[PDB]
Amino acid sequence: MELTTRTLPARKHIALVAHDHCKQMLMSWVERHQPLLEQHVLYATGTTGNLISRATGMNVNAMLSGPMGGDQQVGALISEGKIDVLIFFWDPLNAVPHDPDVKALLRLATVWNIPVATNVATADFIIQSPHFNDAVDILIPDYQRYLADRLK
Amino acid sequence: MELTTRTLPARKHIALVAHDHCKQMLMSWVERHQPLLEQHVLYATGTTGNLISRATGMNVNAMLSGPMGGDQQVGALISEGKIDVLIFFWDPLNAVPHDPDVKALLRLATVWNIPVATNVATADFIIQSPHFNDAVDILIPDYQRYLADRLK
Amino acid sequence: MELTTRTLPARKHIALVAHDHCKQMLMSWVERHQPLLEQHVLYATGTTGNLISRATGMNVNAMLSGPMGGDQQVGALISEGKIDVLIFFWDPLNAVPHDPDVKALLRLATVWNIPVATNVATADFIIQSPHFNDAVDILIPDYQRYLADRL
Amino acid sequence: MELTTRTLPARKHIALVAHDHCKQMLMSWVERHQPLLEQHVLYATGTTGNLISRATGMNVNAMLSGPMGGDQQVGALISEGKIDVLIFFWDPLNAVPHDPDVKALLRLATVWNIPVATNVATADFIIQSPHFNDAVDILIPDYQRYLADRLK
Amino acid sequence: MELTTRTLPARKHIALVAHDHCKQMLMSWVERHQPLLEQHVLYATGTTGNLISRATGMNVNAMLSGPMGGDQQVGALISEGKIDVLIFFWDPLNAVPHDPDVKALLRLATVWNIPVATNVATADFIIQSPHFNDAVDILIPDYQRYLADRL
Amino acid sequence: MELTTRTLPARKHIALVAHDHCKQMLMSWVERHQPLLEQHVLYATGTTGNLISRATGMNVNAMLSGPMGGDQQVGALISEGKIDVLIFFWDPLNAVPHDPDVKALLRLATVWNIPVATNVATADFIIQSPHFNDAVDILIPDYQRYLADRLK
């Protein structure tokens, strides 16, 4: 496949998503890094987003609840290059009816090569990374070349 | 769960999606129903959309290729009430890498209660149906009440 | 692959299936179009089928419960050309233990090209189509040619 | 879940299923045990069944090909108590488009408590078991009591 | 794929795994066949293993709970040729969060060609088989040749 | 779910895994960061591990190939606290026969809270983070308390 590059802005567009049993963990993590997170643009699925802003007073762009289409909205944003970082604390110990949406979101985040964290340890490692506040170049698939081949 | 209603406009916003082995099937279907489809608003995933407009000259709002996020873009539109009909000829005899996206899209179309066709027979029944050109009231989940309960 | 045709009879063999949280939805729908549905042949999975006939008095050929094999029984009938329409209101907001059976059934209905409705909106559009009570030709895979190639 | 019993006849109704890459293995196994298999009733999916009878001359009740609905036909027979043994050599090293059918068939064989072999070693152990040729009593779910509870 | 052979010892290394709703089923099965199981080496996932030894007094090498990694530990042992028989009573009527682990374990047991039972009927047939207490060869993939080809 | 802590050593035990189509990407990544990686303990699935050591001369503890049980071996090591970092470049654009193993491994890495990278962008962020070269305490589920509750 053909690759090209895209630049993640210094001010990142961060998506925050958490399954019910992981919400408390994300809440703590957010409050813990609030000073830093306040410098970036926050997005989240319906319930997560509302709980975060209601507790931290931070401004969060909340989409629909995950089961109602929120995960796909986030996924769409990622593919459109509008989300630079994805913090998705999905529940590995409970079955979710919208599991396909969950897997699809993680698959897209992988395809588009953006930093992704699915647990607190990875989230801390990412946010503490030196370049998390700088503009950073990532290799992404060259869609134009890709689509051109499908139509040749 | 509480329900409410939404009105599908007379002029429908139709999403056209087809997996590679089903593209010819959808092409023919579109061509044979062109006179009727020309009166509605067409959307489609990357490859499908381009092949349709290139062959029929019809105007199609093409999103990204399915594997690159197109299916989630369509799903997001559905959950936002911007797509009224989904024609998704997915391939039942081949494994697709983005199967989760596929299943997630069909799951959302089910949740939001919009007419969905996954084969030619169902597509024909829907397009030939009386209210396909009339405004129709469909029952959809009441998101406001739903979110309110989660945030209680 | 090789395709051929089959004719859906004017009188259709309809399969009615609904997951627990969608049963009320299907019941209402059925009652709504009872006069029309009585003109066709009804089949259903165990619980769904029994609740329908017990409430409407309609004659329903009830198979086993979905989790106990009912979905595969319906799927088998579809592949054998004995089911012409599938009304399957599956639950998109709850995880079902027999999910593979659910996906398998929907996969077969897609392969054999029969009208399928997974929500009320699609069900209404289908039943209101002019040719619902007419015979209609559908393209189905040519199994004979298919198997011949495999051997 | 109340349980009841069912008796597997001395002459068993055996289903033989194999994915393409495992067909040679099943063939060999069938040929090596032909003398014994000949005193039971054989059923199989389309391709497998035809290959077996064309090679061994044995009489096999062949259903549809697995991908065309053959697995669900076998599954239905199992739930109806018409299949006593399932020898299903599915391919663990290749993705199959009809994976849900495959998983659904194995799920049913588990629910109805019939002997199932998914590899040669298990097949050999089962066929060599003393009670393979006698009437065996197995515990199966009591459907009547089960359905009655659902309609309470 | 070129195969090779491996010999299952007379004293089998048996893995016992059961989902919560099937635990009673496995317990009874184990108690009924205790005299025979006593002759082999028993392994199990966390909860299953502890319930068995606590009820039968038998010695069970218990690994982690299935959801916490126990299924993959068993799977790793199988692939390493350290498990000869797998008795896995998984629940076909309930969705399990660690379903991928369950499917991955069953997939590996299939690849490495070891006797596997997912219900009581199959378990009984296997344990009652003559070579269950005998050393016996099984055909297994020839990994060395396989890896050599990948490189 | 009672939580406890575990310390990730300064010298990390890193698992390197890549699907065939992503192998060149991981190779490049490993080569450009070789000086740093040479300081930690490397583990990998069969093919990946062998390709890495054959190309970099680095010492890699290679397990079985992924499809043959390699992923479960890595998963088992993670649950036993023997792996501290997982770099798993799985293919989001191809269906893998051993998908359940892939999902199971990722599910375990999430449960045990260890840093996980599934694309180059995340891998770079993690390796450039301060605590990659230092010892650091992370929270993990308290298994003792967990098991104790299951047997009560």
Coordinates of N, CA, C and O in Angstrom, one line a residue, chain C residues 53-133:
Chain C
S53 N -49.7 -16.9 17.8 CA -50.9 -17.7 17.7 C -51.8 -17.6 18.9 O -53.0 -17.6 18.8
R54 N -51.2 -17.5 20.1 CA -52.0 -17.4 21.3 C -52.7 -16.0 21.4 O -53.7 -15.9 22.0
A55 N -52.1 -15.0 20.8 CA -52.7 -13.7 20.8 C -53.6 -13.4 19.7 O -54.6 -12.7 19.8
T56 N -53.3 -13.9 18.5 CA -54.0 -13.6 17.3 C -55.0 -14.7 16.8 O -55.9 -14.5 16.0
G57 N -54.7 -15.9 17.3 CA -55.5 -17.0 16.9 C -55.1 -17.5 15.5 O -55.6 -18.5 15.0
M58 N -54.1 -16.8 14.9 CA -53.6 -17.2 13.6 C -52.9 -18.5 13.7 O -52.4 -18.9 14.8
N59 N -52.8 -19.2 12.6 CA -52.1 -20.5 12.6 C -50.6 -20.3 12.2 O -50.3 -19.9 11.1
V60 N -49.8 -20.6 13.2 CA -48.3 -20.5 13.0 C -47.6 -21.8 13.2 O -47.8 -22.4 14.2
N61 N -46.7 -22.1 12.2 CA -45.9 -23.3 12.3 C -44.7 -23.0 13.1 O -43.7 -22.5 12.6
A62 N -44.8 -23.2 14.4 CA -43.7 -22.9 15.3 C -42.6 -24.0 15.4 O -42.9 -25.2 15.6
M63 N -41.4 -23.6 15.2 CA -40.2 -24.5 15.3 C -39.7 -24.4 16.7 O -40.4 -24.0 17.6
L64 N -38.4 -24.8 16.9 CA -37.8 -24.8 18.2 C -37.5 -23.4 18.6 O -37.4 -22.5 17.7
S65 N -37.2 -23.1 19.8 CA -36.8 -21.8 20.3 C -35.5 -21.5 19.6 O -34.7 -22.3 19.2
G66 N -35.3 -20.2 19.3 CA -34.1 -19.8 18.6 C -32.8 -20.3 19.2 O -31.9 -20.9 18.5
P67 N -32.6 -20.1 20.5 CA -31.4 -20.6 21.2 C -31.2 -22.1 21.2 O -30.1 -22.7 21.3
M68 N -32.3 -22.9 21.0 CA -32.3 -24.3 21.0 C -32.2 -24.9 19.6 O -32.3 -26.1 19.4
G69 N -32.0 -24.1 18.6 CA -31.9 -24.6 17.2 C -32.9 -24.0 16.2 O -32.8 -24.3 15.0
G70 N -33.9 -23.2 16.7 CA -34.9 -22.7 15.9 C -34.4 -21.8 14.7 O -34.9 -21.9 13.6
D71 N -33.4 -21.0 15.0 CA -32.8 -20.2 13.9 C -32.2 -21.0 12.8 O -32.3 -20.7 11.6
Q72 N -31.6 -22.1 13.1 CA -31.0 -23.0 12.1 C -32.0 -23.7 11.4 O -31.9 -24.1 10.2
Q73 N -33.1 -24.0 12.0 CA -34.2 -24.7 11.4 C -34.8 -23.8 10.3 O -35.1 -24.2 9.2
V74 N -34.9 -22.5 10.6 CA -35.4 -21.5 9.7 C -34.4 -21.3 8.6 O -34.8 -21.3 7.4
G75 N -33.1 -21.3 9.0 CA -32.1 -21.1 8.0 C -32.1 -22.3 7.0 O -31.9 -22.1 5.8
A76 N -32.3 -23.5 7.5 CA -32.3 -24.6 6.6 C -33.5 -24.5 5.7 O -33.3 -24.8 4.5
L77 N -34.6 -24.1 6.2 CA -35.8 -24.0 5.3 C -35.6 -22.9 4.2 O -36.1 -23.1 3.1
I78 N -34.9 -21.9 4.5 CA -34.6 -20.8 3.5 C -33.7 -21.4 2.4 O -34.0 -21.1 1.2
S79 N -32.7 -22.1 2.8 CA -31.8 -22.7 1.8 C -32.4 -23.7 1.0 O -32.0 -24.0 -0.2
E80 N -33.5 -24.3 1.5 CA -34.2 -25.4 0.7 C -35.3 -24.7 -0.1 O -36.1 -25.4 -0.8
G81 N -35.4 -23.4 0.0 CA -36.5 -22.7 -0.8 C -37.9 -22.8 -0.3 O -38.8 -22.6 -1.0
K82 N -38.0 -23.1 1.0 CA -39.3 -23.2 1.6 C -39.8 -22.0 2.4 O -40.9 -22.0 2.9
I83 N -38.9 -21.0 2.5 CA -39.3 -19.8 3.2 C -39.0 -18.7 2.1 O -38.0 -18.6 1.5
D84 N -40.1 -17.8 1.9 CA -40.0 -16.7 0.9 C -39.7 -15.4 1.5 O -39.2 -14.5 0.8
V85 N -40.1 -15.2 2.8 CA -39.9 -13.9 3.4 C -39.4 -14.1 4.9 O -40.0 -14.9 5.6
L86 N -38.4 -13.3 5.3 CA -38.0 -13.4 6.7 C -38.1 -12.1 7.4 O -37.6 -11.0 7.0
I87 N -38.9 -12.1 8.5 CA -39.1 -10.9 9.3 C -38.4 -11.3 10.6 O -38.9 -12.1 11.4
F88 N -37.2 -10.8 10.8 CA -36.4 -11.1 11.9 C -36.1 -9.8 12.7 O -35.1 -9.1 12.4
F89 N -36.8 -9.6 13.8 CA -36.5 -8.4 14.6 C -35.5 -8.8 15.7 O -35.9 -9.2 16.8
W90 N -34.2 -8.7 15.3 CA -33.2 -9.1 16.3 C -32.9 -7.9 17.2 O -33.1 -6.8 16.7
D91 N -32.4 -8.1 18.4 CA -32.1 -7.0 19.3 C -30.7 -6.5 19.1 O -29.7 -7.1 19.4
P92 N -30.6 -5.2 18.7 CA -29.3 -4.6 18.4 C -28.7 -3.9 19.7 O -27.7 -3.3 19.6
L93 N -29.5 -4.0 20.8 CA -29.0 -3.4 22.0 C -28.8 -4.3 23.2 O -28.7 -3.9 24.3
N94 N -28.7 -5.6 22.9 CA -28.5 -6.6 23.9 C -27.7 -7.7 23.3 O -27.9 -8.1 22.1
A95 N -26.8 -8.3 24.0 CA -25.9 -9.4 23.5 C -26.7 -10.7 23.7 O -27.2 -11.0 24.7
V96 N -26.7 -11.5 22.6 CA -27.4 -12.8 22.7 C -26.4 -13.9 22.6 O -25.5 -13.9 21.8
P97 N -26.6 -14.9 23.5 CA -25.6 -16.0 23.5 C -25.5 -16.7 22.2 O -24.4 -17.1 21.8
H98 N -26.6 -16.9 21.5 CA -26.6 -17.6 20.2 C -26.4 -16.6 19.0 O -27.0 -16.8 18.0
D99 N -25.6 -15.6 19.2 CA -25.3 -14.6 18.2 C -24.8 -15.3 16.9 O -25.2 -14.8 15.8
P100 N -24.0 -16.3 16.9 CA -23.5 -16.9 15.7 C -24.7 -17.4 14.9 O -24.8 -17.3 13.6
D101 N -25.7 -18.0 15.5 CA -26.9 -18.5 14.9 C -27.7 -17.4 14.2 O -28.2 -17.5 13.1
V102 N -27.7 -16.2 14.9 CA -28.4 -15.1 14.4 C -27.7 -14.6 13.1 O -28.4 -14.3 12.1
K103 N -26.4 -14.4 13.2 CA -25.7 -13.9 12.0 C -25.7 -14.9 10.9 O -25.8 -14.6 9.7
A104 N -25.7 -16.2 11.2 CA -25.8 -17.3 10.2 C -27.1 -17.2 9.5 O -27.1 -17.4 8.2
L105 N -28.2 -17.0 10.2 CA -29.5 -16.9 9.6 C -29.6 -15.8 8.6 O -30.0 -15.9 7.5
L106 N -29.1 -14.6 9.1 CA -29.2 -13.4 8.2 C -28.2 -13.6 7.0 O -28.5 -13.1 5.9
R107 N -27.1 -14.3 7.2 CA -26.2 -14.5 6.1 C -26.8 -15.4 5.0 O -26.6 -15.1 3.8
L108 N -27.6 -16.4 5.4 CA -28.3 -17.2 4.5 C -29.4 -16.5 3.7 O -29.6 -16.7 2.5
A109 N -30.2 -15.7 4.4 CA -31.2 -15.0 3.8 C -30.7 -14.0 2.8 O -31.3 -13.8 1.8
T110 N -29.4 -13.6 3.0 CA -28.8 -12.7 2.0 C -28.3 -13.5 0.8 O -28.5 -13.1 -0.3
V111 N -27.7 -14.7 1.1 CA -27.2 -15.5 0.0 C -28.3 -16.0 -0.9 O -28.2 -15.9 -2.2
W112 N -29.4 -16.4 -0.4 CA -30.6 -16.9 -1.1 C -31.5 -15.9 -1.7 O -32.6 -16.2 -2.2
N113 N -31.1 -14.6 -1.5 CA -31.9 -13.5 -2.0 C -33.4 -13.4 -1.8 O -34.2 -13.3 -2.7
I114 N -33.8 -13.5 -0.5 CA -35.2 -13.4 -0.2 C -35.4 -12.1 0.6 O -34.5 -11.6 1.2
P115 N -36.6 -11.5 0.5 CA -36.9 -10.3 1.2 C -36.7 -10.5 2.7 O -37.2 -11.4 3.3
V116 N -35.9 -9.6 3.3 CA -35.6 -9.7 4.7 C -35.9 -8.3 5.4 O -35.4 -7.3 4.9
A117 N -36.5 -8.4 6.6 CA -36.8 -7.2 7.3 C -36.3 -7.4 8.7 O -36.6 -8.3 9.4
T118 N -35.4 -6.4 9.2 CA -34.9 -6.5 10.6 C -35.4 -5.5 11.5 O -35.0 -5.4 12.7
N119 N -36.3 -4.6 11.0 CA -36.9 -3.5 11.8 C -38.3 -3.3 11.2 O -38.6 -3.7 10.1
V120 N -39.1 -2.6 12.0 CA -40.5 -2.3 11.6 C -40.6 -1.5 10.3 O -41.4 -1.8 9.4
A121 N -39.7 -0.5 10.1 CA -39.7 0.3 8.9 C -39.6 -0.5 7.7 O -40.3 -0.3 6.7
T122 N -38.6 -1.4 7.7 CA -38.4 -2.3 6.5 C -39.5 -3.3 6.3 O -39.9 -3.6 5.2
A123 N -40.1 -3.7 7.4 CA -41.2 -4.7 7.4 C -42.4 -4.0 6.7 O -43.1 -4.7 5.9
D124 N -42.7 -2.8 7.1 CA -43.8 -2.1 6.5 C -43.6 -1.9 5.0 O -44.6 -2.1 4.2
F125 N -42.4 -1.4 4.6 CA -42.2 -1.2 3.2 C -42.4 -2.4 2.4 O -42.9 -2.4 1.3
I126 N -41.9 -3.6 2.9 CA -42.0 -4.8 2.2 C -43.5 -5.3 2.1 O -43.9 -5.5 1.0
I127 N -44.2 -5.4 3.2 CA -45.6 -5.8 3.2 C -46.5 -4.9 2.4 O -47.5 -5.4 1.9
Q128 N -46.1 -3.7 2.2 CA -46.9 -2.7 1.5 C -46.6 -2.6 0.0 O -47.2 -1.9 -0.8
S129 N -45.5 -3.3 -0.3 CA -45.1 -3.3 -1.7 C -46.2 -4.0 -2.5 O -46.9 -4.9 -2.1
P130 N -46.5 -3.4 -3.7 CA -47.6 -3.9 -4.6 C -47.5 -5.4 -4.9 O -48.5 -6.1 -4.9
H131 N -46.3 -5.9 -5.1 CA -46.1 -7.3 -5.5 C -45.9 -8.3 -4.3 O -45.4 -9.4 -4.5
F132 N -46.3 -7.9 -3.1 CA -46.2 -8.8 -2.0 C -47.1 -10.0 -2.2 O -46.7 -11.1 -1.8
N133 N -48.2 -9.8 -2.7 CA -49.2 -10.9 -3.0 C -49.1 -11.5 -4.4 O -49.9 -12.3 -4.8

